Amino acid sequence: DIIAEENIVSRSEFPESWLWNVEDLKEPPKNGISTKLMNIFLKDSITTWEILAVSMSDKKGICVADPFEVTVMQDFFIDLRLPYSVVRNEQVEIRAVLYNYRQNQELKVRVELLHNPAFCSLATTKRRHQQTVTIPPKSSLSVPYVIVPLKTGLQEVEVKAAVYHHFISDGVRKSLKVVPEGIRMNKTVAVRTLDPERLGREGVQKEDIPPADLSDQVPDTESETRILLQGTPVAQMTEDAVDAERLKHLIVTPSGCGEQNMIGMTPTVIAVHYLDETEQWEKFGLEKRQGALELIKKGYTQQLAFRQPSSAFAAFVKRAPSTWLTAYVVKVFSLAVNLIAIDSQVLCGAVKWLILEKQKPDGVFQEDAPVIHQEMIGGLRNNNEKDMALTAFVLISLQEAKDICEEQVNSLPGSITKAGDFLEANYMNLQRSYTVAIAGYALAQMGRLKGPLLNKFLTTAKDKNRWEDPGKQLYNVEATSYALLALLQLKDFDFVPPVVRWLNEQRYYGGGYGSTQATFMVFQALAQYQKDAPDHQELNLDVSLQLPSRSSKITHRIHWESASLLRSEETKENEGFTVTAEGKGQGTLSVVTMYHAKAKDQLTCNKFDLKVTIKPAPNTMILEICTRYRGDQDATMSILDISMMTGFAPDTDDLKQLANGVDRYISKYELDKAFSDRNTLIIYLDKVSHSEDDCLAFKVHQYFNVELIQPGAVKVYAYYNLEESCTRFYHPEKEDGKLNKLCRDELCRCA
Amino acid sequence: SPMYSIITPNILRLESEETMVLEAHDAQGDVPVTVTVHDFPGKKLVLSSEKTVLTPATNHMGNVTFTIPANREFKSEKGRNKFVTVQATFGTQVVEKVVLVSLQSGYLFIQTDKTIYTPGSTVLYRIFTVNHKLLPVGRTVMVNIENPEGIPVKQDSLSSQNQLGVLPLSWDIPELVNMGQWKIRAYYENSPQQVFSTEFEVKEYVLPSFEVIVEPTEKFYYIYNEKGLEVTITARFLYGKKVEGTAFVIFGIQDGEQRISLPESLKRIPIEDGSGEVVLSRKVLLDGVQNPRAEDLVGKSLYVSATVILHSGSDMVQAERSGIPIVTSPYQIHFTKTPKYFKPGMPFDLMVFVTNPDGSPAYRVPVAVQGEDTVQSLTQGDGVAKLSINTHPSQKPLSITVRTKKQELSEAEQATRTMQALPYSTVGNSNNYLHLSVLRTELRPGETLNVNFLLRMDRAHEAKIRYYTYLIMNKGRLLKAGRQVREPGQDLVVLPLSITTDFIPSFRLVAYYTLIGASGQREVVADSVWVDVKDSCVGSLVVKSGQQPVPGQQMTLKIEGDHGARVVLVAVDKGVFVLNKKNKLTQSKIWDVVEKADIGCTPGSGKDYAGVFSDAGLTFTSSSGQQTAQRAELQCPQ
Amino acid sequence: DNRVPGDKNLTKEGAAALCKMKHLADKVAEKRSQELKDRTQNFAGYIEFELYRIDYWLEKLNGPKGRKDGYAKLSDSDIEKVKEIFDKAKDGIAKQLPEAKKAGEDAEKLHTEVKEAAANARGQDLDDHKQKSTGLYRVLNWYCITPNCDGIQFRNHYLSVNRSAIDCSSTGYEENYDWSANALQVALNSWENVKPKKLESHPCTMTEEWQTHYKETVKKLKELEGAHEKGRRAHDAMLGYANTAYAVNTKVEQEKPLAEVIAAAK
């Protein structure tokens, strides 16, 4: 009158999460809402599932539904409290908890543990480990099972139960993660640094990572080696820009004659350009840009009034055109191209007039109508090499207007080349620092500045920071700005920092009289420095790994935009491999290895000491337990869990005596339980001495006789660190308490 | 002379249908309007162009919608922001404003099927891609799985255009991983500056068979309560039935990150019928901190740690109830929802917010203003009570103190708070003011809200105001705009504003008028009111049984929600949440993210008309030079 | 290409000379030839530009607004004399165009010739023990295997499994910018003077096969430089007339008297 073992299907599906499914509602709406019906199959776990539904609609957006709870339930069932993992050869005890929630019915239950070759236990292929128990209504019972794992990897433990005189049965098959007899450990194989330009040779650096020692690695254990190609971006020093508030006075309305209009408009144009390049508008006030642009447009319109018929310019229409004035206007407009809508026709006509009419056959430009306001031309105010300075100025203007008027003026490149040749033919004979700097910038604009030209240009620098020349310091500032522009053109960034530092230290923020050329040039140079100066050390590392386990050369690339990314590689092998790095940059190659190392000390039962023993009483036995705490102080509060061997139960009177003790407390639940079926017991200890063995003992005697007696178990631990417990086993015959097994060569055979 | 003006949010988001409203006060006949958006300061690329006409049929008011493409020029080159010059051409007149641009153009919500994982198990997670309106959006997002040490283990890039905003993903945890709080980080490829993340713990565990609930009797400790803190331990199996066992309870004092454990408080109690009671006597609490003084404990939070062990000894569960504040007053008063600026000579409305020490809104707690205790108000379900107080035309800071006036508490226990309200500056000292007011009920969609427009201003010009313009801002966009008519001699008018689900979670209504006042100057008077709408799904989604189940039984699950929507499900054993219940996805968090991403962070008017718009998040520009001060910070001050 | 017995070990001077050879050859291959070709063709560019300018000035003299645009001040006799001088200048400039064009055309092919020759002479610097190097690179890399060379610093390349390639940067040769034909010729002479002699049939030495290309490069480069000189010479002739043409235009635009105008040209 009992369900046969073979006929009991076993619950085996215990996923912690499931129903990871996507559903689209498509049924005809009712009252604006559509309903979908799902036929889900509930898993085997007896718990309260929580179902969370998230929906996305193209119109109603996201929505998260109130979680729905489904409570799977059953009148009678067993719950296996398997540990997360067990050691390959350490005897362990697992508890199968039988629940009987029938309101008023007592159940006689046959519960057995099925045999698995992977585990050594009382169960064998010839005889099963059966056991008959009784469960009071609305109560629970725990049957302990002693097993010894024998194989690594996941192993399944199956328990089956049946009820006499009822067609009720249940069976659970959970899985244990048996692990080798060791402790996970990590070791740093090597921590190198990659720097091909400094630590490599011929632009390449080769690194060899020796295989990890792993002398302590447990045999047949999985190991992992992790490689991290961490880039290390390095910031580059950058000089501070000019404070926006200093430029407040530069913005001025243009007015006056054709010459004065330039004087008025140029500071505004250069200030606007500087603010745009440095993006200082936030502090300056975003609104003021519109007024500044309106002023620039007004100045441009006023200047166009003086445009002579030949496309040239002069202080007055009747006055003959001035080469320098035309070149300066071309320069300013070229700066204003990306600010206001200038008529390319005017600029190109001026350029064409300069090229055709005001250039000597040899390439020298000539000025015939000196500017009315001699203070305007700045450093050209006093000149000895006037030809060269004027040619360089005109050539700078032409180079700036090239990209605008190259297609409209076919002769421009020839003029530029002729001017460059003339400059090269005489660059060595220059004396003034101003002329040298301006001509150097002109040449660098076309790449002709090289060799002795560059040598002379750099040599002329005073103190390696300024192209000073005795006289009005505005001319020196202008020359220094020209030289800085030339250097930025050459990309010689190792010389710029001192020059920009000197310029900033001059603390020049523009001005009025005799300050047009200096202001324009210095601010243009500073804007160019901010635009082009590198803020970061170049980082373009190209790296590769040659792993024997890998069939191909793995590689990675790191750029400044991706330097922060921690590129990494994973390897499931221990072997020597070579890492090759190339290109500029820096990176901290790091290699670590993880593995299971053989135990160094007592891997378990370190905090507590247990001394369980059992002896015949003067069938009945006297169980004696002694405990101690390995530490500097007494344990705060300890749980002393006891699992009786099959057929033995504690004596009621002794428990009552212990419960009536001073430092020990036993729940009324246990004392009220009948003598039989009290196979599991808990004694709560207020404290356990660390300097002495605290002992307790009580009678245990047979209420039932069996062929084989499963060893009992005792577990001790503080109330807060169950993971730090200590356990022991006792058995009347097998004094050691361990099941018989033969561990030949660290592989154990059940017996 | 006509006054053309444009109102637009002070922060524009890349690739989003930002709305702009144009108006022509005192204009005659139709006026064509052209809107163009240019890069700043380049003014070289026309990111967008729009055109429309303002006609009397629309009261010379009309909106224009444009979306700025996410051009690659927009980058954090050196951490500096970016701007666009909104430019509107009203026939010949041109009105332009420089408006900040924010790259982050949406939210990413990450759902992990479980809150805790074991090594070797698969992490199943989803990423939801939604624009700033919480609608599904198709964009490229890349996600990184981050080791607790910060090493990105896995890196992916995906495009959601093929799905309705949900991106399923998976990853297998290697057996050798390190334990701790692993992190998932994801962001749109177009905005690396903002990274959304969610944490999932990796730990070795076995699901517990029951849940332990530690519930203090009063969710706070009154420092003078000699009865001591009483805590009820409730334990029940996950399948609904009650637990029997023994529980260990220990109390401790927490101050900031530091924790102190009171060893003398450790008590062992029997759990019978699934519940048990334990008490932390005041003497123990005082002596545990060396008994400096009773007041010294105020502000420090207790925490209760409970461990429950079944009589069978087969299982054990640990639960904590942190953050039990020690307070001298059962309530806290917050002014976070009140306007900090008041209109002199007109009623001032305080939306005083009073909450329990744990932060939950208090209910039906009377509040009052010192010196005017004759008038009292009771909190609504949301814990907000409205108090009205007259003000004198003094142009001086106003100091206000409110006191809870519950009958059952002694005077010393009553909570109190103080704040200062600065005068609303009026242009040209014309003492012209506008004041909005709403009846603060538990507002929910489907209701009609009567917004009152109260106007105070000199009688010499009363007839010139014949309509109030109002705007409704929600989720950082102009949900709606319109005009409310007024007649001469009508000092108060009511706007029957109807509320749809769009207004969730809160909408900041802004209103204003304009006139040619003293000396012919163009006066603009504006006011703002912040209204809270009860949080809930803008749509709906309900999961219910379509028919207790036994294991392996087939069950009919009914899902009902918005038609055509994509529903993604997940089932989690409740045992998981016993180990770690943090980082769960819930509708409240979605609204929390949206609220914290709002562009205006003030509940009401500012110091002047410019402040009113700037605080509400709107820019206002006019032909007559009326403007709001520039905004240069994505995160608003403090 | 292959080693042979020699007269003595390679002294440091020999290594310096070889590195000088290689450096000059590489520079000729990269920059000098291109510079020469460009500057040669620029003469043909400039001569045509001056023709265009002459035509433009003549059009200003006679055309839609000859009597209005500045030149109007000129009388008919002044017009005639200006026409005479401009026409003489035009004939003079035109007389030189074909020479410059021919020189540029010659330089066009000479550039390819020299480029190929110099590039072949330099070599590729390949990993010899897998892929043989070439030219002076082959010589430098394969010469001093390891007691045949005392007093040298070798490259530390990781690809130097069994190679002792000379590190030229260590030779300390000056970075002079003279890259004329003589520059190659002089250095070549230096190598021959210091070059250890090949033993008739002991220290080893490298064959002189590379000299085939290098010596040729000098020949062609000399021709290329000669063409540049030919064009440059033509360029000089034009300036004599061109300056006269420019001067007269400058004076008239200043409204200066004819006597100055005629005097300025002369």
Author numbering:
A (entry chain B): 754 to 1371, 1382 to 1514
B (entry chain A): 23 to 569, 574 to 664
C (entry chain C): 25 to 170, 179 to 233, 249 to 313
What did the study's authors say about this model?
To improve the resolution of the region containing the binding site, local refinement was performed using a mask covering ISG65 and the TED and CUB domains of C3b, resulting in a volume at 3.4 Å resolution. While our previous structure did not have interpretable electron density for loops L2 and L3, perhaps due to their disorder, or due to proteolysis during crystallisation, most of L2 and parts of L3 were ordered and resolved in our cryogenic electron microscopy-derived volume. In particular, L2 directly contacts the CUB domain of C3b, with an electrostatic interaction centered around C3b residue Arg954. The presence of this additional contact between ISG65 and C3b, which is not present between ISG65 and the TED domain alone, explains the differences in affinity of ISG65 for C3, C3b, and C3d.
These come together at the conversion of serum complement C3 into C3b and the deposition of C3b on a pathogen surface through the formation of a thioester bond between the TED domain of C3b and cell surface components. We reveal through cryogenic electron microscopy that ISG65 has two distinct binding sites for C3b, only one of which is available in C3 and C3d.
